[PDB]
Design a protein around this ligand. Structure first.
Ligand SMILES: *[C@@H]1O[C@H](CO)[C@@H](O)[C@H](O)[C@H]1NC(C)=O
Lengths: 15, 199
C-alpha cells in the first residue's frame, strides 16, 4: 500500500 | 495477495553502529517508507530492557506505523529506569524526557564490552544541571557555563564557575549500576488507515 508509512512484517504480508 | 513496497527499515544502521551518541546529544534517525520486522530485534534477545508503551511488544509485528523515529544514546545502568514516561531523574529531567502520552518502545542493552575501557571512557557526557526542565523530545546541547560568582567566566571552567556537562567515565570494572547501556527509543504513531491491511 501507501509509500511513506512503516509497515510491520505481518501487516506487509496483508498488504 | 501481491506485495508492493520493497524496502527494509535500516535497523542495522542504527544498532550495529560504531559509536552511539552521548545522552545529551541523542541522535535521531527518520524511518519511513519501509517494512520492519521486530521479530528479529526481539529474537536477538540480548537487550536488557525491551518494553513498549501503548501496544504490546509481542503483537507489534502485525501493525502499520507512521512517523517512526529512532533515537539512540548511551546512559548508565542505574539510569535505564529514567527512560520512561513521567520518570524524574538526573537524565530525564535534563537530558532526554519521554512525554506523558508516549506511544513508542524502549530498547536497552549492556555495552560494557565496547563503551568502556581500562582507565574509563569519558566521551559519553550527561547534562548535570539546566536552568529549566526539558520538554519532551527537546534537544539542548548548549555548553554555557554557570557563573554564579563575582567575576565573569568568559568561557572558562573554574571555581565559583561551573560547567554543565559531566563525563560518565565507564570503566569495565564498574558495578552493573555504573556500567554503560546503549538505548534506542522508537517513537511512532499507530496507523489503521487501510481497514483490511491494518485492522
Ligand atoms: C504501490 O505503491 C506506489 C508507491 O510507490 C503507489 O503509488 C501505488 O498506488 C501502489 N499500488 C497500488 C495498486 O495502489
Amino acid at each position: 500500500x501507501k509509500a511513506g508509512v512503516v509497515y510491520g512484517y505481518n501487516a506487509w504480508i496483508r498488504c | 495477495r501481491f506485495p508492493n513496497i520493497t524496502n527494509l527499515c535500516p535497523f542495522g544502521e542504527v544498532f550495529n553502529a560504531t559509536r552511539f551518541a552521548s545522552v545529551y546529544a541523542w541522535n535521531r534517525k527518520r524511518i519511513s517508507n519501509c517494512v520492519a520486522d521486530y521479530s528479529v530485534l526481539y529474537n536477538s534477545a540480548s537487550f536488557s530492557t525491551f518494553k513498549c508503551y501503548g501496544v504490546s511488544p509481542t503483537k507489534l509485528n502485525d501493525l502499520c506505523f507512521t512517523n517512526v523515529y529512532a533515537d539512540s544514546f548511551v546512559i548508565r545502568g542505574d539510569e535505564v529506569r529514567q527512560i520512561a514516561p513521567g520518570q524524574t531523574g538526573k537524565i530525564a529531567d535534563y537530558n532526554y524526557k519521554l512525554p506523558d502520552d508516549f506511544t513508542g518502545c524502549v530498547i536497552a542493552w549492556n555495552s560494557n564490552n565496547l563503551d568502556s575501557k581500562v582507565g574509563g571512557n569519558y566521551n559519553y557526557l550527561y547534562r548535570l544541571f539546566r536552568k529549566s526542565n526539558l520538554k519532551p523530545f527537546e534537544r539542548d546541547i548548549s555548553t554555557e557555563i554557570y557563573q554564579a560568582g563575582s567575576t565573569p567566566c568568559n568561557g572558562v571552567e573554574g571555581f565559583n564557575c561551573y560547567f554543565p556537562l559531566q563525563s560518565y567515565g565507564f570503566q569495565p570494572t564498574n558495578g552493573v549500576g555504573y556500567q554503560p547501556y546503549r538505548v534506542v527509543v522508537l517513537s511512532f504513531e499507530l496507523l489503521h488507515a487501510p481497514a483490511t491491511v491494518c485492522g
